[model samples]
Target: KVFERCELARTLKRLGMDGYRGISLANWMCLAKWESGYNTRATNYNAGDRSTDYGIFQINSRYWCNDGKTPGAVNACHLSCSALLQDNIADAVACAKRVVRDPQGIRAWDAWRNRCQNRDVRQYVQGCGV
Candidate 1:
C-alpha cells in the first residue's frame, strides 16, 4: 500500500497543480495497473539485461534510490529521502506529468512510450480538456 495512486494525486494537487486534482486520479490508477499492477514491491528483474528499475513505477533504482542504503532503497523516499520518495504513486505521477503535458495526446504519451509504455495503461487521458 505504499505510495498508492490516490495518495499520489493528493501530492500533485498539493504541489499547486490543481488541474491534476480530480483528473489525474483515474489516469494514474490505470497507469499503476499496467506499470506495477499496483504492487509497491514490484521490481523489474529483467529490464534490458539487468537494468534496476524499481518500485510500482519501475523507476531505475540506481538513479532513484541507489544510495547504498536500505532494502527498499529503490523506493522513492527510501532513496531520495524526500517525501516524494515514500509515495511511489506521487513520484510516478510526477514523472508522468514531467513527460506528458496536461491534456496530453497519444503522440505525446507515445513519445515517451518506450520508457513509459506500460506506465500509461489508459492508453491516454479521456476528458482532460487539454
Candidate 2:
C-alpha cells in the first residue's frame, strides 16, 4: 500500500515501533521515504551482486529475505522477498526489527547512512502527533 507519511508513522507507532530500541519514528519515516517512498510494491535489483531489495524498507535479499533466485541467500527473516511487496507491512516490520538489532543498527540502510545520519528528521513525523 502507498501510505502518507503521517499514516505510516501512526501505524508504525501503533505497532510498538515509535521508539523501538534506539531508533525513533522520525528516523524510521525518513529511511522509509528515502528507501521506497512508502511504496509497498517497490523492488530494486542489483545486477552486480544479483541481490534484490524489497518493500518499503528495502530489506535486502542477501540476508533479510529470500528472493528464491538469490544464491546463498541467508533468509534471516525466514520469509519470501515477495511477501514484503504486499500492502500489509507486518512482515516487513518484523524483518526490519531484526535488521535494526544487528550491530549496524539503523545504519544497515544506506539511505539512512547517507541521508538521515545525524540529520534532524523530526520533520518526517512532525504533525503525526504520535
Candidate 3:
C-alpha cells in the first residue's frame, strides 16, 4: 500500500505515533516519505553490508528484523523481515517504535539525518488533522 499523505498521517496518529518516544509524528512522516515514499512493500538491499531495508519505515534486517540471509543479524524486533512488507503495517509500525527506544531516536535512519532532521518536517503532517 502506498498511502496518501493525509491518510498516513491519520493512521500514524491513531497508532500513537504523534509523540511516540519523544519523536513527533512529522518526524516519522518525513522518514517514511524519504525512505519509501509511503509504500508498504518497499525494499532495498545494501550489498555493501549484505543487509536489507524493508517496509515503509525501511527497517533494516541487520539488527532489527531477521531475513535469514543477513549474516549475524540480531533480529531485535524478533520477527521475520517479511512482516515489514505487509500492507497491514501493524508489524512495521511496532518495529519502528522499537527502533527509537535507542539513543539514536529517529537519527537511526540515515534518511532522517540527511533530509528530515532540522528541515521543515511540518510539511509531512500539515493539514492532516492528525
The stretch of ten residues in a row with the least summed lDDT in candidate 2 is 12-21
The lDDT of each candidate is 0.47, 0.90, 0.92
Ranking by lDDT: 3, 2, 1
Candidate 3, 52: how far from true, in Å?
Answer: 0.6
Return the top candidate by lDDT: 3
Using alpha carbons, what is the TM-score of model 3?
0.97
> Candidate 2, residue 3: CA error in Å?
0.7
Model 1, 34-67: lDDT tens per residue? 5666666666654444445555555554444453
By TM-score, rank the candidates, best first.
Answer: 3, 2, 1
Where in model 1 is the C-alpha error above 4 Å?
A: 2-23, 67-130
lDDT of 2 by residue, 38-121 (tens): 998999999988899999999999998988898777999999998899898988999999888889999989889999999988
Q: What are the TM-scores, per candidate, against the unseen true structure?
A: 0.42, 0.97, 0.97
